[PDB]
Short mmCIF file of C-alpha atoms and ligand atoms in Angstrom, two decimals:
data_model
loop_
_atom_site.label_atom_id
_atom_site.label_comp_id
_atom_site.label_asym_id
_atom_site.label_seq_id
_atom_site.Cartn_x
_atom_site.Cartn_y
_atom_site.Cartn_z
CA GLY A 1 -0.69 -62.13 33.12
CA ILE A 2 -3.44 -60.24 31.32
CA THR A 3 -4.48 -63.32 29.34
CA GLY A 4 -7.13 -65.59 30.78
CA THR A 5 -10.83 -66.18 31.25
CA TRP A 6 -12.49 -63.20 32.90
CA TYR A 7 -16.08 -62.81 34.05
CA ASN A 8 -17.88 -59.65 35.07
CA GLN A 9 -20.81 -58.44 37.13
CA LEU A 10 -23.39 -59.17 34.43
CA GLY A 11 -22.09 -62.70 33.98
CA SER A 12 -20.52 -62.35 30.56
CA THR A 13 -17.38 -64.27 29.61
CA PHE A 14 -14.24 -62.69 28.17
CA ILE A 15 -11.50 -65.04 26.94
CA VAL A 16 -8.35 -63.09 26.13
CA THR A 17 -4.75 -63.56 25.01
CA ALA A 18 -2.26 -60.72 25.14
CA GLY A 19 0.51 -60.26 22.61
CA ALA A 20 4.24 -59.68 22.58
CA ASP A 21 3.90 -56.43 20.65
CA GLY A 22 0.76 -55.27 22.42
CA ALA A 23 -1.99 -57.03 20.50
CA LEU A 24 -5.08 -58.46 22.20
CA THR A 25 -7.10 -61.36 20.80
CA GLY A 26 -9.82 -63.68 21.99
CA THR A 27 -13.58 -64.12 22.19
CA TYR A 28 -16.38 -62.50 24.16
CA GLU A 29 -19.72 -64.07 25.10
CA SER A 30 -22.21 -61.50 26.35
CA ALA A 31 -24.56 -63.11 28.84
CA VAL A 32 -27.11 -60.31 28.34
CA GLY A 33 -28.43 -58.42 25.33
CA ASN A 34 -28.99 -59.17 21.66
CA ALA A 35 -26.34 -61.88 21.31
CA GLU A 36 -26.06 -65.65 21.54
CA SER A 37 -22.52 -66.99 20.94
CA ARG A 38 -18.89 -66.20 21.46
CA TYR A 39 -18.02 -63.10 19.42
CA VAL A 40 -14.73 -61.87 18.02
CA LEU A 41 -12.82 -59.16 19.87
CA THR A 42 -9.63 -57.31 19.03
CA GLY A 43 -7.79 -54.57 20.87
CA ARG A 44 -4.52 -53.25 22.22
CA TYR A 45 -2.64 -52.54 25.44
CA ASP A 46 0.75 -51.04 26.22
CA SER A 47 3.66 -53.23 27.26
CA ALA A 48 5.67 -51.01 29.61
CA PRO A 49 3.29 -51.28 32.53
CA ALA A 50 4.62 -48.35 34.64
CA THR A 51 6.07 -50.21 37.63
CA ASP A 52 5.54 -47.37 40.14
CA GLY A 53 2.31 -49.12 41.15
CA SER A 54 -0.27 -48.12 38.57
CA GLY A 55 -2.52 -50.35 36.48
CA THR A 56 -1.99 -51.35 32.86
CA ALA A 57 -4.15 -49.35 30.46
CA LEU A 58 -5.95 -51.44 27.87
CA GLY A 59 -8.84 -51.38 25.44
CA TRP A 60 -10.67 -53.56 22.93
CA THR A 61 -13.51 -53.76 20.42
CA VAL A 62 -16.30 -56.24 19.66
CA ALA A 63 -18.70 -56.02 16.73
CA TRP A 64 -21.93 -57.96 17.26
CA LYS A 65 -21.86 -60.11 14.12
CA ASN A 66 -21.53 -63.86 13.67
CA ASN A 67 -23.30 -66.82 12.12
CA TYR A 68 -26.21 -66.70 14.56
CA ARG A 69 -27.29 -63.09 15.04
CA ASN A 70 -26.40 -59.58 13.93
CA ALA A 71 -27.31 -56.41 15.79
CA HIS A 72 -25.37 -54.04 13.47
CA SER A 73 -23.62 -52.63 16.52
CA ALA A 74 -20.14 -52.28 17.96
CA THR A 75 -18.92 -51.88 21.53
CA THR A 76 -15.56 -50.71 22.85
CA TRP A 77 -14.07 -51.07 26.32
CA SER A 78 -11.29 -48.95 27.77
CA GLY A 79 -10.00 -49.62 31.26
CA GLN A 80 -7.05 -50.58 33.40
CA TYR A 81 -5.89 -53.96 34.66
CA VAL A 82 -5.18 -53.64 38.39
CA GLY A 83 -3.03 -56.67 39.08
CA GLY A 84 -2.26 -57.77 42.62
CA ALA A 85 -3.56 -60.39 44.99
CA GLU A 86 -6.97 -59.70 43.47
CA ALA A 87 -6.61 -59.59 39.69
CA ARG A 88 -9.15 -56.98 38.61
CA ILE A 89 -9.97 -55.16 35.38
CA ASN A 90 -12.16 -52.08 35.63
CA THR A 91 -13.42 -50.88 32.25
CA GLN A 92 -15.83 -48.27 30.98
CA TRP A 93 -17.47 -48.86 27.64
CA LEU A 94 -19.44 -47.47 24.72
CA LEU A 95 -22.02 -49.18 22.50
CA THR A 96 -22.91 -47.73 19.09
CA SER A 97 -25.71 -49.07 16.90
CA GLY A 98 -26.22 -48.27 13.24
CA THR A 99 -29.09 -45.80 13.04
CA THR A 100 -30.57 -43.49 10.45
CA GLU A 101 -29.24 -39.93 10.34
CA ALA A 102 -32.41 -38.69 12.03
CA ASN A 103 -31.82 -40.98 15.03
CA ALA A 104 -28.18 -40.02 15.40
CA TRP A 105 -28.40 -38.64 18.92
CA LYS A 106 -29.67 -41.82 20.58
CA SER A 107 -27.22 -44.24 18.99
CA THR A 108 -24.60 -44.45 21.72
CA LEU A 109 -24.90 -46.11 25.13
CA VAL A 110 -22.36 -45.82 27.94
CA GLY A 111 -21.70 -48.04 30.94
CA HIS A 112 -19.15 -49.71 33.18
CA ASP A 113 -17.90 -53.26 33.81
CA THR A 114 -15.74 -54.89 36.49
CA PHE A 115 -13.85 -57.96 35.30
CA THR A 116 -12.62 -60.63 37.71
CA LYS A 117 -10.48 -63.62 36.79
CA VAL A 118 -11.77 -66.39 39.05
CA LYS A 119 -15.25 -64.85 39.41
CA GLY B 1 -15.32 -48.05 1.12
CA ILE B 2 -14.45 -47.64 4.78
CA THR B 3 -10.71 -47.88 4.07
CA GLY B 4 -8.80 -44.70 3.36
CA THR B 5 -7.05 -41.70 4.86
CA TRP B 6 -9.37 -39.78 7.17
CA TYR B 7 -8.75 -36.52 8.98
CA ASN B 8 -10.76 -34.98 11.79
CA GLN B 9 -11.52 -31.64 13.40
CA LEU B 10 -8.36 -31.63 15.53
CA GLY B 11 -6.19 -32.37 12.51
CA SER B 12 -5.17 -35.91 13.35
CA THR B 13 -4.64 -38.51 10.62
CA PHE B 14 -6.29 -41.94 10.56
CA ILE B 15 -5.11 -44.40 7.90
CA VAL B 16 -7.38 -47.44 7.82
CA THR B 17 -7.96 -50.68 5.93
CA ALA B 18 -11.10 -52.73 6.45
CA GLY B 19 -11.18 -56.50 6.28
CA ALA B 20 -13.17 -59.22 4.58
CA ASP B 21 -14.20 -60.77 7.89
CA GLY B 22 -14.67 -57.49 9.72
CA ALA B 23 -11.17 -56.67 10.88
CA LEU B 24 -9.80 -53.12 10.90
CA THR B 25 -6.10 -52.29 10.62
CA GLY B 26 -3.97 -49.23 10.03
CA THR B 27 -2.17 -46.39 11.77
CA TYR B 28 -3.21 -43.27 13.65
CA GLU B 29 -1.20 -40.06 14.04
CA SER B 30 -2.64 -37.79 16.72
CA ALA B 31 -1.92 -34.18 15.85
CA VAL B 32 -2.50 -33.13 19.47
CA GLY B 33 -1.55 -34.57 22.85
CA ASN B 34 1.31 -36.65 24.23
CA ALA B 35 2.26 -38.38 20.98
CA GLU B 36 4.66 -37.89 18.08
CA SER B 37 4.42 -40.61 15.38
CA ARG B 38 2.00 -42.90 13.65
CA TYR B 39 0.61 -45.36 16.21
CA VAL B 40 -0.87 -48.82 15.81
CA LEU B 41 -4.65 -49.24 15.81
CA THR B 42 -6.84 -52.31 15.66
CA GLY B 43 -10.60 -52.69 15.74
CA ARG B 44 -13.70 -54.21 14.22
CA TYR B 45 -16.84 -53.37 12.25
CA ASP B 46 -19.79 -55.41 11.04
CA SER B 47 -20.11 -56.42 7.41
CA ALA B 48 -23.86 -56.49 6.80
CA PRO B 49 -24.31 -52.74 6.70
CA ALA B 50 -28.14 -52.60 7.09
CA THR B 51 -29.16 -51.26 3.66
CA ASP B 52 -32.35 -49.52 4.87
CA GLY B 53 -30.30 -46.31 5.05
CA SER B 54 -28.42 -46.45 8.33
CA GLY B 55 -24.71 -46.03 8.95
CA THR B 56 -22.17 -48.79 9.51
CA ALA B 57 -21.28 -49.24 13.18
CA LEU B 58 -17.57 -49.50 13.86
CA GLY B 59 -14.98 -49.19 16.59
CA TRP B 60 -11.23 -49.36 17.19
CA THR B 61 -8.45 -49.10 19.75
CA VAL B 62 -5.08 -47.34 19.93
CA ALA B 63 -2.53 -47.74 22.71
CA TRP B 64 -0.08 -44.84 22.96
CA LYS B 65 3.18 -46.79 22.78
CA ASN B 66 5.92 -46.82 20.15
CA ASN B 67 9.64 -46.26 19.76
CA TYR B 68 9.42 -42.53 20.44
CA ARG B 69 7.09 -41.93 23.38
CA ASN B 70 4.88 -43.82 25.81
CA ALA B 71 1.99 -42.31 27.74
CA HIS B 72 0.81 -45.62 29.29
CA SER B 73 -2.67 -44.90 27.98
CA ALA B 74 -5.23 -46.38 25.63
CA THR B 75 -8.06 -44.79 23.66
CA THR B 76 -11.09 -46.38 22.00
CA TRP B 77 -13.44 -44.94 19.40
CA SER B 78 -16.96 -46.17 18.67
CA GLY B 79 -19.03 -44.54 15.97
CA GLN B 80 -20.84 -44.98 12.70
CA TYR B 81 -19.69 -44.45 9.12
CA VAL B 82 -22.33 -42.37 7.34
CA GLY B 83 -21.53 -42.99 3.69
CA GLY B 84 -23.11 -40.89 0.96
CA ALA B 85 -22.06 -37.97 -1.17
CA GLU B 86 -20.20 -36.74 1.92
CA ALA B 87 -18.29 -39.65 3.42
CA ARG B 88 -18.41 -38.98 7.16
CA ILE B 89 -17.50 -40.92 10.29
CA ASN B 90 -18.85 -39.63 13.59
CA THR B 91 -17.22 -41.27 16.60
CA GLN B 92 -17.30 -40.84 20.35
CA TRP B 93 -14.28 -41.94 22.31
CA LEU B 94 -12.75 -42.80 25.67
CA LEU B 95 -9.17 -42.31 26.90
CA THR B 96 -7.86 -44.27 29.89
CA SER B 97 -4.48 -43.66 31.49
CA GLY B 98 -2.74 -45.97 33.92
CA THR B 99 -3.12 -44.43 37.37
CA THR B 100 -2.63 -45.53 40.94
CA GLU B 101 -5.63 -47.03 42.74
CA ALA B 102 -6.10 -43.79 44.67
CA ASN B 103 -6.45 -41.79 41.44
CA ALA B 104 -8.90 -44.21 39.87
CA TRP B 105 -11.78 -41.78 39.45
CA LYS B 106 -9.94 -39.29 37.23
CA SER B 107 -8.40 -41.80 34.82
CA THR B 108 -10.94 -41.69 32.01
CA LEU B 109 -11.59 -38.87 29.54
CA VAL B 110 -14.47 -38.72 27.09
CA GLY B 111 -14.90 -36.78 23.86
CA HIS B 112 -16.11 -36.77 20.27
CA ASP B 113 -14.51 -36.72 16.81
CA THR B 114 -15.82 -36.13 13.28
CA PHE B 115 -13.82 -37.87 10.57
CA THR B 116 -13.84 -36.68 6.96
CA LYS B 117 -12.15 -38.41 4.05
CA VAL B 118 -10.93 -35.55 1.87
CA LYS B 119 -10.72 -33.07 4.77
CA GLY C 1 -37.64 -41.32 50.22
CA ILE C 2 -34.95 -39.94 47.93
CA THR C 3 -33.90 -37.32 50.50
CA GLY C 4 -31.20 -38.21 52.99
CA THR C 5 -27.48 -38.48 53.61
CA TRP C 6 -25.84 -40.73 51.03
CA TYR C 7 -22.24 -41.89 50.85
CA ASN C 8 -20.46 -43.55 47.95
CA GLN C 9 -17.51 -45.79 47.19
CA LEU C 10 -14.96 -42.97 47.26
CA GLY C 11 -16.23 -41.78 50.63
CA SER C 12 -17.85 -38.53 49.57
CA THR C 13 -20.98 -37.23 51.28
CA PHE C 14 -24.17 -36.21 49.48
CA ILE C 15 -26.90 -34.52 51.54
CA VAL C 16 -30.08 -34.20 49.51
CA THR C 17 -33.69 -33.04 49.79
CA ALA C 18 -36.21 -33.82 47.07
CA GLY C 19 -39.03 -31.48 46.13
CA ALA C 20 -42.77 -31.62 45.61
CA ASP C 21 -42.49 -30.44 42.01
CA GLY C 22 -39.34 -32.39 41.22
CA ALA C 23 -36.60 -30.10 42.47
CA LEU C 24 -33.47 -31.41 44.19
CA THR C 25 -31.44 -29.38 46.68
CA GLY C 26 -28.66 -30.01 49.17
CA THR C 27 -24.90 -30.06 49.58
CA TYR C 28 -22.09 -32.30 48.39
CA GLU C 29 -18.71 -32.84 50.08
CA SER C 30 -16.24 -34.59 47.80
CA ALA C 31 -13.83 -36.64 49.88
CA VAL C 32 -11.33 -36.73 47.00
CA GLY C 33 -10.08 -34.19 44.47
CA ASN C 34 -9.57 -30.44 44.40
CA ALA C 35 -12.18 -29.54 47.00
CA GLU C 36 -12.41 -28.94 50.74
CA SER C 37 -15.95 -28.11 51.98
CA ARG C 38 -19.58 -28.83 51.37
CA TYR C 39 -20.51 -27.53 47.91
CA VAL C 40 -23.84 -26.47 46.46
CA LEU C 41 -25.76 -28.89 44.25
CA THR C 42 -28.98 -28.51 42.31
CA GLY C 43 -30.83 -30.92 40.06
CA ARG C 44 -34.09 -32.57 39.11
CA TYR C 45 -35.93 -35.89 39.16
CA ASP C 46 -39.33 -37.01 37.92
CA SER C 47 -42.19 -37.60 40.32
CA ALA C 48 -44.20 -40.39 38.70
CA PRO C 49 -41.77 -43.15 39.56
CA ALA C 50 -43.10 -45.87 37.18
CA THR C 51 -44.48 -48.40 39.67
CA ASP C 52 -43.95 -51.46 37.44
CA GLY C 53 -40.69 -52.03 39.31
CA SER C 54 -38.15 -49.69 37.74
CA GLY C 55 -35.92 -47.15 39.42
CA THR C 56 -36.48 -43.40 39.62
CA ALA C 57 -34.39 -41.46 37.11
CA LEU C 58 -32.60 -38.46 38.56
CA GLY C 59 -29.75 -36.07 37.93
CA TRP C 60 -27.93 -33.12 39.48
CA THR C 61 -25.13 -30.59 39.08
CA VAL C 62 -22.32 -29.28 41.30
CA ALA C 63 -19.96 -26.43 40.41
CA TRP C 64 -16.71 -26.49 42.37
CA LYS C 65 -16.79 -22.96 43.78
CA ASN C 66 -17.09 -21.71 47.35
CA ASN C 67 -15.30 -19.53 49.87
CA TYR C 68 -12.36 -21.91 50.24
CA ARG C 69 -11.31 -23.15 46.81
CA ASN C 70 -12.27 -22.83 43.16
CA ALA C 71 -11.36 -25.33 40.46
CA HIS C 72 -13.37 -23.61 37.67
CA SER C 73 -15.09 -26.91 36.98
CA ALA C 74 -18.55 -28.44 37.00
CA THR C 75 -19.73 -32.02 37.41
CA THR C 76 -23.08 -33.61 36.60
CA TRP C 77 -24.51 -36.93 37.74
CA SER C 78 -27.30 -38.85 36.03
CA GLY C 79 -28.52 -42.12 37.46
CA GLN C 80 -31.43 -44.03 38.91
CA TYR C 81 -32.53 -44.54 42.50
CA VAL C 82 -33.18 -48.26 43.01
CA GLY C 83 -35.29 -48.30 46.15
CA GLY C 84 -35.99 -51.52 48.01
CA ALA C 85 -34.62 -53.25 51.06
CA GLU C 86 -31.24 -51.87 50.00
CA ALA C 87 -31.66 -48.21 49.08
CA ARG C 88 -29.17 -47.70 46.25
CA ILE C 89 -28.42 -44.94 43.76
CA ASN C 90 -26.27 -45.82 40.78
CA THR C 91 -25.07 -42.77 38.86
CA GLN C 92 -22.72 -42.06 35.99
CA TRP C 93 -21.12 -38.66 35.82
CA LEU C 94 -19.21 -36.09 33.79
CA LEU C 95 -16.64 -33.52 34.94
CA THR C 96 -15.82 -30.50 32.77
CA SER C 97 -13.04 -28.04 33.55
CA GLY C 98 -12.60 -24.64 31.97
CA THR C 99 -9.76 -24.95 29.47
CA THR C 100 -8.35 -22.90 26.63
CA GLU C 101 -9.72 -23.58 23.15
CA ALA C 102 -6.54 -25.47 22.26
CA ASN C 103 -7.06 -27.90 25.15
CA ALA C 104 -10.71 -28.51 24.36
CA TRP C 105 -10.44 -32.25 23.77
CA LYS C 106 -9.11 -33.16 27.23
CA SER C 107 -11.56 -31.10 29.28
CA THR C 108 -14.13 -33.76 30.11
CA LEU C 109 -13.76 -36.73 32.47
CA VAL C 110 -16.26 -39.56 32.84
CA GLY C 111 -16.85 -42.00 35.67
CA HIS C 112 -19.34 -43.86 37.83
CA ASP C 113 -20.54 -43.71 41.45
CA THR C 114 -22.63 -46.00 43.66
CA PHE C 115 -24.51 -44.19 46.42
CA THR C 116 -25.67 -45.98 49.57
CA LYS C 117 -27.78 -44.46 52.32
CA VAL C 118 -26.42 -46.04 55.50
CA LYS C 119 -22.96 -46.69 54.02
CA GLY D 1 -23.69 -13.01 29.30
CA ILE D 2 -24.51 -16.68 29.72
CA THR D 3 -28.26 -15.98 29.85
CA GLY D 4 -30.22 -16.01 26.62
CA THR D 5 -31.98 -18.14 24.04
CA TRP D 6 -29.65 -20.79 22.65
CA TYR D 7 -30.29 -23.28 19.86
CA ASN D 8 -28.24 -26.33 18.95
CA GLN D 9 -27.51 -28.63 16.03
CA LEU D 10 -30.63 -30.74 16.53
CA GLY D 11 -32.84 -27.66 16.62
CA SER D 12 -33.81 -27.71 20.28
CA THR D 13 -34.34 -24.49 22.23
CA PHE D 14 -32.66 -23.67 25.54
CA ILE D 15 -33.84 -20.54 27.38
CA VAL D 16 -31.54 -19.78 30.29
CA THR D 17 -30.95 -17.21 33.03
CA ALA D 18 -27.78 -17.24 35.09
CA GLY D 19 -27.66 -16.25 38.74
CA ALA D 20 -25.66 -13.97 40.99
CA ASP D 21 -24.56 -16.85 43.21
CA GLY D 22 -24.10 -19.35 40.40
CA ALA D 23 -27.60 -20.70 39.90
CA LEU D 24 -29.01 -21.51 36.47
CA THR D 25 -32.72 -21.46 35.65
CA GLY D 26 -34.89 -21.58 32.57
CA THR D 27 -36.71 -23.92 30.21
CA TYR D 28 -35.67 -26.42 27.56
CA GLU D 29 -37.71 -27.53 24.53
CA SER D 30 -36.26 -30.62 22.88
CA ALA D 31 -37.04 -30.57 19.18
CA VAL D 32 -36.42 -34.33 18.94
CA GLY D 33 -37.31 -37.32 21.10
CA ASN D 34 -40.12 -38.24 23.47
CA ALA D 35 -41.10 -34.71 24.46
CA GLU D 36 -43.54 -32.01 23.39
CA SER D 37 -43.30 -28.78 25.45
CA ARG D 38 -40.88 -26.56 27.27
CA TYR D 39 -39.43 -28.51 30.21
CA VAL D 40 -37.92 -27.34 33.47
CA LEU D 41 -34.13 -27.21 33.83
CA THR D 42 -31.91 -26.36 36.76
CA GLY D 43 -28.14 -26.32 37.09
CA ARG D 44 -25.04 -24.47 38.20
CA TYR D 45 -21.95 -22.70 36.90
CA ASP D 46 -18.99 -21.03 38.59
CA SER D 47 -18.71 -17.26 38.77
CA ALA D 48 -14.97 -16.61 38.65
CA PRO D 49 -14.57 -17.33 34.97
CA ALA D 50 -10.74 -17.70 34.86
CA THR D 51 -9.78 -14.63 32.79
CA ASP D 52 -6.60 -16.16 31.31
CA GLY D 53 -8.67 -17.05 28.24
CA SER D 54 -10.51 -20.25 29.12
CA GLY D 55 -14.21 -20.98 28.90
CA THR D 56 -16.71 -20.96 31.76
CA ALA D 57 -17.54 -24.45 33.01
CA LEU D 58 -21.24 -25.10 33.47
CA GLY D 59 -23.79 -27.87 33.80
CA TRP D 60 -27.53 -28.46 34.15
CA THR D 61 -30.28 -31.04 34.50
CA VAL D 62 -33.67 -31.64 32.87
CA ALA D 63 -36.17 -34.30 33.90
CA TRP D 64 -38.65 -35.20 31.17
CA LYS D 65 -41.89 -34.63 33.08
CA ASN D 66 -44.67 -32.09 32.57
CA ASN D 67 -48.40 -31.88 32.00
CA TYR D 68 -48.21 -33.36 28.50
CA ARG D 69 -45.84 -36.33 28.52
CA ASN D 70 -43.58 -38.26 30.86
CA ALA D 71 -40.68 -40.44 29.77
CA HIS D 72 -39.44 -41.22 33.32
CA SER D 73 -35.99 -40.05 32.28
CA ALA D 74 -33.44 -37.40 33.17
CA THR D 75 -30.66 -35.80 31.16
CA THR D 76 -27.64 -33.80 32.30
CA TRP D 77 -25.34 -31.55 30.29
CA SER D 78 -21.82 -30.53 31.27
CA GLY D 79 -19.81 -28.23 29.06
CA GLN D 80 -18.04 -24.91 28.75
CA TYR D 81 -19.25 -21.56 27.47
CA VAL D 82 -16.65 -20.24 25.02
CA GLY D 83 -17.50 -16.56 24.83
CA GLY D 84 -15.99 -14.33 22.17
CA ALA D 85 -17.10 -12.90 18.86
CA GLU D 86 -18.93 -16.21 18.37
CA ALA D 87 -20.79 -17.06 21.57
CA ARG D 88 -20.62 -20.85 21.73
CA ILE D 89 -21.46 -23.50 24.31
CA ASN D 90 -20.08 -26.98 23.76
CA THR D 91 -21.64 -29.58 26.04
CA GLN D 92 -21.52 -33.33 26.44
CA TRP D 93 -24.50 -35.04 27.99
CA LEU D 94 -25.97 -38.14 29.58
CA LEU D 95 -29.53 -39.49 29.42
CA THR D 96 -30.77 -42.00 32.01
CA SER D 97 -34.14 -43.73 31.81
CA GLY D 98 -35.82 -45.62 34.62
CA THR D 99 -35.41 -49.31 33.87
CA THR D 100 -35.83 -52.57 35.73
CA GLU D 101 -32.78 -53.95 37.54
CA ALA D 102 -32.33 -56.55 34.79
CA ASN D 103 -32.05 -53.83 32.14
CA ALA D 104 -29.59 -51.74 34.12
CA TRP D 105 -26.75 -51.82 31.61
CA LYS D 106 -28.65 -50.22 28.72
CA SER D 107 -30.20 -47.34 30.67
CA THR D 108 -27.70 -44.60 29.91
CA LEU D 109 -27.12 -42.80 26.61
CA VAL D 110 -24.27 -40.40 25.88
CA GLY D 111 -23.91 -37.67 23.28
CA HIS D 112 -22.76 -34.16 22.47
CA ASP D 113 -24.40 -30.81 21.69
CA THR D 114 -23.15 -27.48 20.32
CA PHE D 115 -25.18 -24.48 21.46
CA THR D 116 -25.22 -21.22 19.50
CA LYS D 117 -26.93 -18.01 20.58
CA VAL D 118 -28.21 -16.53 17.33
CA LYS D 119 -28.41 -19.90 15.55
O1 BTN E 1 -27.04 -54.07 22.52
C1 BTN E 1 -26.81 -54.85 21.57
O2 BTN E 1 -27.14 -54.48 20.42
C2 BTN E 1 -26.18 -56.20 21.78
C3 BTN E 1 -25.91 -56.49 23.25
C4 BTN E 1 -24.57 -55.90 23.69
C5 BTN E 1 -24.13 -56.40 25.06
C6 BTN E 1 -23.58 -55.23 25.85
S1 BTN E 1 -22.18 -54.68 25.14
C7 BTN E 1 -21.63 -53.96 26.70
C8 BTN E 1 -22.27 -54.68 27.86
N1 BTN E 1 -21.32 -55.59 28.45
C9 BTN E 1 -21.62 -56.84 28.15
O3 BTN E 1 -20.86 -57.95 28.53
N2 BTN E 1 -22.74 -56.90 27.45
C10 BTN E 1 -23.33 -55.59 27.30
O1 BTN E 2 -3.59 -38.11 26.32
C1 BTN E 2 -2.60 -38.83 26.06
O2 BTN E 2 -2.07 -39.45 27.00
C2 BTN E 2 -2.05 -38.94 24.65
C3 BTN E 2 -2.80 -38.06 23.66
C4 BTN E 2 -4.04 -38.76 23.13
C5 BTN E 2 -4.66 -38.05 21.94
C6 BTN E 2 -6.17 -38.04 22.10
S1 BTN E 2 -6.75 -39.60 22.00
C7 BTN E 2 -8.38 -38.98 21.52
C8 BTN E 2 -8.26 -37.63 20.87
N1 BTN E 2 -8.36 -37.76 19.44
C9 BTN E 2 -7.19 -37.58 18.87
O3 BTN E 2 -6.95 -37.70 17.49
N2 BTN E 2 -6.27 -37.28 19.77
C10 BTN E 2 -6.85 -37.15 21.08
O1 BTN E 3 -11.57 -32.41 39.64
C1 BTN E 3 -11.79 -31.31 40.19
O2 BTN E 3 -11.49 -30.27 39.58
C2 BTN E 3 -12.41 -31.23 41.57
C3 BTN E 3 -12.65 -32.62 42.18
C4 BTN E 3 -13.99 -33.19 41.72
C5 BTN E 3 -14.40 -34.42 42.51
C6 BTN E 3 -14.96 -35.45 41.55
S1 BTN E 3 -16.38 -34.89 40.88
C7 BTN E 3 -16.90 -36.58 40.52
C8 BTN E 3 -16.25 -37.55 41.47
N1 BTN E 3 -17.18 -37.93 42.50
C9 BTN E 3 -16.86 -37.37 43.65
O3 BTN E 3 -17.60 -37.51 44.83
N2 BTN E 3 -15.75 -36.66 43.54
C10 BTN E 3 -15.18 -36.79 42.22
O1 BTN E 4 -35.17 -39.90 25.28
C1 BTN E 4 -36.15 -39.51 25.94
O2 BTN E 4 -36.67 -40.29 26.76
C2 BTN E 4 -36.73 -38.12 25.75
C3 BTN E 4 -36.00 -37.34 24.66
C4 BTN E 4 -34.76 -36.65 25.21
C5 BTN E 4 -34.17 -35.63 24.24
C6 BTN E 4 -32.66 -35.78 24.25
S1 BTN E 4 -32.06 -35.33 25.74
C7 BTN E 4 -30.44 -34.98 25.01
C8 BTN E 4 -30.58 -34.64 23.55
N1 BTN E 4 -30.50 -33.22 23.37
C9 BTN E 4 -31.69 -32.71 23.08
O3 BTN E 4 -31.94 -31.34 22.90
N2 BTN E 4 -32.60 -33.66 23.00
C10 BTN E 4 -32.00 -34.97 23.15
#
C-alpha cells in the first residue's frame, strides 16, 4: 500500500514500488530545480509496520544524473507513511552537491515535503 | 574507488560496493544504538565526478530491520566523498522513527558522520 | 509588522516584538512537549527586508527553563516571514538536549513549523 | 565558564558572554562566506547544567547585517557545551536566506561546527 504515484506540495512526481524484503524502487521527476526528466531512486523501509497506530518509517535516495542533465548532487528523504483514510507521507530531506573543499560548509540544503497519493 | 570498508567516529562499520550505473549496495553495522548485526543499505551516487577538484556527491538509506532486532526506523545519509591522499567521506544524516500522529514533531533526529577508509 | 501573536500547526503560541536595531524579544508557550508555561525567547532578524519580493529572514532561540519545569534543552528556529495578504512565517528548527558524551549522536532533533498570525 | 573567545574548524571567531538569567550576548566574525566584520549575536542557554555529567544545552542567532555588508540571511546554532579538561562546544546550525516564494525550497542550509576555546 506504499507503492503508487505520489505528488507533493511543489508538484513533483514520485512513482514508487515497495518490495517484499523491504526494498524501494521507482522514479522521481522533480518539478522544480536543476532537473528535467524522471530520475532513478532507491531506498528502504521496514516491513513490520508497528500496528499500534504509528506510521511506517521509510527513506530513499536520488542522484541527479541521467541522459539529459547532471547537477553532481544527491538528495535523500526520510519520513513516515501515515496511512489511513488520507494516505499521506511526510518526509524531511537533505540535498548535497559536490563542492570544493573550501566550499564544504555550504554544500548541504535541508527541507521538508508532504506527499499525497491522489494529489 | 568508493567501494570498501569504511569506519567512522562512532566506530560503526560501513561495507559498500559502488555500481556501474550509479547504484550503491552493501551492509552497515552500527556500533551504537538499538541495533546488533549488519543491516542492509541501498543508495545512489553520480558517476561523472566533476574533475575540477570537487568531491563526489552520494547518499544512502538503511532501515533498522533484520532477524535480530527491529526499531521501526530508517536513517539516510547524504554527503560527499573527498578522495585524495586521505580518502574521506563526510556525511550528514537523518533518522526517522515510526511514531503516532500526536508525536510527529519529535520523530526525526539529525547528525553528522565522518567516514575514513583505513580508520 | 513582524511583531504579534503567532500560532502554528501544533497549537503553540509565540508572542513576539521586533526591534529597531534587529532584536527580537517575547515569550513562547509550547502546546506540546516537556513544558508548561510561557518561556523566554531571544533572537535576531535583518532590517533591510529586500523589497524585490522576498521574505524577511529571521531566527530565534528558546531554552526550556523556568520556575515550573526544566528539560535542560534548547531549541532554535530559522525561517522567513512571508508577508502579504496572508501573513505567514515558515521556520525550520533544531532541538538539542544535554546528554552524556556517549549519547552525543542522538541529542539533536529537527523539524518544521508554519506560523500564522490570526490562526 | 561558557563565556570567552571561541574559534572553530573554519576559523571563525565567536566572542560570548553568558548571563545570570540565561541570556547570551557577544559578537561573531565569520571567517568564511558573505561577511566582513564582527556581527551581533543573541541567544539563550539553561542555567541548571544537569550535574550528572552531561553537557549544557545552548543556542544562539546571528543575522548577517551591519554597516559593511548585508546578505539578508540569518543563522542559528544549537549545541551543547561539553566542559572538562578540553572545553568544547559542538553545535549544529541552520542558515536561512530571504528568497522569493518560488525559491522557497532551497533557502535553508544545514551544517555543523566544533568550537574550541584556545584553538
Ligand atoms: O538542486 C539541484 O541541484 C537539483 C534540484 C533538486 C530538486 C530538489 S531535491 C529536494 C526537493 N524536492 C523536490 O521534489 N525537488 C527539490
Ligand atoms: O536509533 C535507532 O532507532 C537505532 C540506532 C541507529 C543508529 C544511528 S543511525 C545514525 C547514526 N550513525 C550510526 O552509525 N549509528 C547512528
Ligand atoms: O523536547 C523537550 O525537551 C521540550 C519540548 C520542546 C517543544 C518543541 S521545541 C520545537 C517544537 N515546536 C514547538 O512549538 N514545540 C516543539
Ligand atoms: O551565507 C551567507 O549568506 C553569509 C555567510 C554565513 C557564514 C556561515 S553561517 C554558518 C557557518 N559558520 C560560520 O562561522 N560561517 C558559516
